[PDB]
Scaffold this active site. Structure first.
Site, PDB file in Angstrom:
ATOM      1  N   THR A 268      58.832  56.035  56.480  1.00 18.38           N
ATOM      2  CA  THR A 268      59.362  54.728  56.196  1.00 18.38           C
ATOM      3  C   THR A 268      58.928  53.741  57.324  1.00 18.38           C
ATOM      4  OG1 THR A 268      61.362  55.788  56.803  1.00 18.38           O
ATOM      5  CG2 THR A 268      61.286  55.208  54.259  1.00 18.38           C
ATOM      6  N   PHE A 393      68.993  50.457  55.235  1.00 18.73           N
ATOM      7  CA  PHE A 393      69.171  51.474  55.963  1.00 18.73           C
ATOM      8  C   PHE A 393      70.312  52.492  55.371  1.00 18.73           C
ATOM      9  CE2 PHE A 393      66.689  49.116  59.001  1.00 18.73           C
ATOM     10  CZ  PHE A 393      65.750  50.098  59.335  1.00 18.73           C
ATOM     11  N   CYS A 400      71.373  55.486  58.045  1.00 20.44           N
ATOM     12  CA  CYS A 400      70.041  55.951  58.543  1.00 20.44           C
ATOM     13  C   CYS A 400      70.534  55.946  60.183  1.00 20.44           C
ATOM     14  CB  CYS A 400      69.147  54.853  58.651  1.00 20.44           C
ATOM     15  SG  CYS A 400      67.583  55.566  59.449  1.00 20.44           S
TER      16      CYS A 400
HETATM   17  C1  HEM Z   1      62.073  52.594  59.132  1.00 20.67           C
HETATM   18  C2  HEM Z   1      62.827  52.504  58.120  1.00 20.67           C
HETATM   19  C3  HEM Z   1      63.656  53.346  57.573  1.00 20.67           C
HETATM   20  C4  HEM Z   1      64.263  53.152  56.358  1.00 20.67           C
HETATM   21  C5  HEM Z   1      64.244  52.165  55.438  1.00 20.67           C
HETATM   22  C6  HEM Z   1      65.300  54.151  56.318  1.00 20.67           C
HETATM   23  C7  HEM Z   1      66.390  54.388  55.370  1.00 20.67           C
HETATM   24  C8  HEM Z   1      67.422  55.426  55.218  1.00 20.67           C
HETATM   25  C9  HEM Z   1      68.222  55.428  54.039  1.00 20.67           C
HETATM   26  C10 HEM Z   1      68.374  54.601  52.896  1.00 20.67           C
HETATM   27  C11 HEM Z   1      69.055  56.452  54.466  1.00 20.67           C
HETATM   28  C12 HEM Z   1      70.339  56.918  53.484  1.00 20.67           C
HETATM   29  C13 HEM Z   1      69.787  58.083  52.595  1.00 20.67           C
HETATM   30  C14 HEM Z   1      70.646  57.993  51.380  1.00 20.67           C
HETATM   31  O1  HEM Z   1      71.708  57.467  51.453  1.00 20.67           O
HETATM   32  O2  HEM Z   1      70.215  58.605  50.326  1.00 20.67           O
HETATM   33  C15 HEM Z   1      68.621  57.293  55.478  1.00 20.67           C
HETATM   34  C16 HEM Z   1      69.166  58.144  56.342  1.00 20.67           C
HETATM   35  C17 HEM Z   1      68.738  58.839  57.449  1.00 20.67           C
HETATM   36  N1  HEM Z   1      67.635  58.477  57.872  1.00 20.67           N
HETATM   37 FE1  HEM Z   1      66.551  56.686  57.861  1.00 20.67          FE
HETATM   38  N2  HEM Z   1      65.251  54.961  57.532  1.00 20.67           N
HETATM   39  C18 HEM Z   1      64.148  54.625  58.058  1.00 20.67           C
HETATM   40  C19 HEM Z   1      63.924  54.939  59.345  1.00 20.67           C
HETATM   41  C20 HEM Z   1      64.410  56.252  59.864  1.00 20.67           C
HETATM   42  C21 HEM Z   1      64.066  56.784  61.336  1.00 20.67           C
HETATM   43  C22 HEM Z   1      63.135  56.144  62.257  1.00 20.67           C
HETATM   44  C23 HEM Z   1      64.632  58.157  61.242  1.00 20.67           C
HETATM   45  C24 HEM Z   1      64.655  58.981  62.570  1.00 20.67           C
HETATM   46  C25 HEM Z   1      65.263  60.036  62.800  1.00 20.67           C
HETATM   47  C26 HEM Z   1      65.439  58.354  60.180  1.00 20.67           C
HETATM   48  C27 HEM Z   1      65.793  59.376  59.940  1.00 20.67           C
HETATM   49  C28 HEM Z   1      67.070  59.415  59.109  1.00 20.67           C
HETATM   50  C29 HEM Z   1      67.955  60.681  58.740  1.00 20.67           C
HETATM   51  C30 HEM Z   1      68.253  61.701  59.635  1.00 20.67           C
HETATM   52  C31 HEM Z   1      69.072  60.141  57.749  1.00 20.67           C
HETATM   53  C32 HEM Z   1      70.108  61.027  56.983  1.00 20.67           C
HETATM   54  C33 HEM Z   1      71.540  60.711  58.088  1.00 20.67           C
HETATM   55  C34 HEM Z   1      72.729  61.331  57.456  1.00 20.67           C
HETATM   56  O3  HEM Z   1      72.573  61.333  56.233  1.00 20.67           O
HETATM   57  O4  HEM Z   1      73.530  61.411  58.356  1.00 20.67           O
HETATM   58  N3  HEM Z   1      65.026  57.162  59.440  1.00 20.67           N
HETATM   59  N4  HEM Z   1      67.406  56.445  56.311  1.00 20.67           N
END
Ligand code: HEM
Ligand code: NI
Ligand code: NI
Ligand code: NI
Ligand code: NI
Length: 460
Positions: A268, A393, A400
């Site tokens: 992403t 996010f 996120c």
């Molecule tokens: C750059 C744009 C990014 C966007 C738009 C984004 C978007 C999201 C979204 C919408 C979720 C929630 C998922 C859900 O509710 O179904 C999420 C969770 C998560 N993201 Fe990101 N993300 C980005 C970057 C990153 C980065 C750099 C990492 C680095 C590790 C990452 C790792 C994670 C992880 C591990 C979760 C789950 C955390 C949890 O459920 O406790 N993402 N992200």
């Protein structure tokens, strides 16, 4: 006042399934939102879900006391290789809270300071490549942003170098990853996924998993075959113990975490840097305003942690890019109990809600009439933005965990790109957004003419 749930064209026992027979399902879902309004039911052979598009309804959806994160059918398919990981696990599942508490300090503000040195290491390599291109050659933006982001998460998180810039065609992992996500999607289209017609799709799918698993074994190999004393993401996966239970993550979960952070921690981010550059070359004097700030702030060979944190207009462009086209365009929710959404739509306990993020960010009652224009100036004061009006996010505790990681990397890289290069739209490139659950523009090419500004030597 109970309103009846509106719903698009139905199609027999396939319900609403034949309405998404495109490789752009999310974009198709957006078109439906403009047609039927702020909410509509989407029915599938075994599934029922409701897509939200207005800030008003999504406002209540983000109420954690009423709603919790749901595994959509997309995430249920990703769970085939992501598994018990941090992205595809239920909130009530034992390993989410366990891994959350262990890995959250790895994304603290003090952890971000440590990642910066390695972030510049990869960011420079990106500049090195573009600096060393012959005058005729084209720059493939999404392909090189993928190289940038993949090497960054692997290095900062696992002390591992993919060396994507030392590679011609994309990394074997990327090929397996993209094809896996592409298989997760389109499987949402199969009425009978267990029909042997998709047996070659399945056996190709679990071949890509083997590739991803092979990489994980090697990351663990290089780590256990120490190796200096470390303090990164992988270090906490192996040694970190949950304060609430006192236990460390079992190896089945650890391997699921590595797979998760390798994919979620770059894909992403790559799309964002791609979308941002596209909106910059399409909006000249907005790119000019941003090009100046990079030159005005980054007064050193290589950027510092403080300098990236003060590239404020660059961050505004990134947020506005995340607004118009969030690379993770949807997250699902389920009702913890029986309740009424927006005082109009009654929901059973366990009913699913899909937050259509692009249509949320195009709420005319929130941003105005210029919802399609690219004005980074919208994010002048984040204070003026309503709660849950802008959520690229995710929401709440399921938000996120690497938001700061992404935004810092996206700001650090884009800043150096504007400091060292002018950019030209070699084609009159028409935006083609390829969907693989996530969003990323495809076939986007530019040409950079260097400002001939030297670098440092990335030492740390
Ligand atoms: C750059 C744009 C990014 C966007 C738009 C984004 C978007 C999201 C979204 C919408 C979720 C929630 C998922 C859900 O509710 O179904 C999420 C969770 C998560 N993201 Fe990101 N993300 C980005 C970057 C990153 C980065 C750099 C990492 C680095 C590790 C990452 C790792 C994670 C992880 C591990 C979760 C789950 C955390 C949890 O459920 O406790 N993402 N992200
Ligand atoms: Ni009423
Ligand atoms: Ni050419
Ligand atoms: Ni530690
Ligand atoms: Ni302007």
């Amino acid at each position: 006042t109970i309103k009846e749930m509106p719903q698009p064209k139905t199609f027999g026992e396939l319900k609403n399934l034949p309405l998404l027979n495109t490789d752009k399902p999310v974009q198709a879902l957006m078109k439906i939102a403009d047609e039927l309004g702020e909410i509509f039911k989407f029915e599938a052979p075994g599934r029922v879900t409701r897509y939200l598009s207005s800030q008003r309804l999504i406002k209540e959806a983000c109420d954690e006391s009423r709603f919790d994160k749901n595994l959509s059918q997309a995430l249920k398919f990703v769970r085939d290789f992501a598994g018990d990981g941090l992205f595809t696990s239920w909130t009530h599942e034992k390993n989410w809270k366990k891994a959350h508490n262990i890995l959250l300090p790895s994304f603290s503000q003090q952890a971000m300071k440590g990642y910066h040195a390695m972030m510049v290491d990869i960011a420079v390599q990106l500049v090195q490549k573009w600096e060393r291109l012959n005058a005729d050659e084209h720059i493939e933006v999404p392909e090189d942003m993928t190289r940038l982001t993949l090497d960054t998460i692997g290095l900062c998180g696992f002390n591992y170098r993919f060396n994507s810039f030392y590679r011609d065609q994309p990394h074997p992992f990327i090929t397996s990853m993209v094809r896996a996500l592409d298989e997760a999607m389109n499987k949402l289209q199969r009425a009978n996924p267990d029909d042997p017609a998709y047996d070659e799709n399945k056996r190709q799918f679990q071949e890509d998993i083997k590739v991803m698993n092979d990489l994980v074994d090697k990351i663990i190999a290089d780590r256990k075959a120490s190796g200096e004393q470390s303090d990164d993401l992988l270090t906490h996966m192996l040694n970190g113990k949950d304060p609430e239970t006192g236990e460390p993550l079992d190896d089945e979960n650890i391997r699921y975490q590595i797979i998760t952070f390798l994919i979620a921690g770059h894909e992403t981010t790559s799309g964002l840097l791609s979308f941002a550059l596209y909106f910059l070359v399409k909006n000249p004097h907005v790119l000019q305003k941003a090009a100046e700030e990079a030159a005005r702030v980054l007064v050193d060979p290589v950027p510092s942690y403080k300098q990236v944190k003060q590239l404020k207009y660059v961050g505004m462009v990134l947020n506005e890019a995340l607004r118009l086209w969030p690379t993770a365009p949807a997250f699902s929710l389920y009702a913890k109990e029986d309740t009424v959404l927006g005082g109009e739509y009654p929901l059973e306990k366990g009913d699913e809600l899909m937050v259509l993020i692009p249509q949320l960010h195009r709420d005319k009652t929130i941003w105005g009439d210029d919802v399609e224009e690219f004005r980074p100036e919208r994010f002048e004061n984040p204070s003026a933005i309503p709660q849950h009006a802008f959520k690229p996010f995710g929401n709440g505790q399921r938000a996120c965990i690497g938001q700061q990681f992404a935004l810092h990397e996206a700001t650090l890289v884009l800043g150096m790109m504007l400091k060292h290069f002018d950019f030209e739209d070699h084609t009159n490139y028409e935006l083609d957004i390829k969907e693989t659950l996530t969003l990323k523009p495809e076939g986007f090419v530019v040409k950079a003419k260097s400002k001939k500004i030297p670098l440092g030597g990335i030492p740390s």
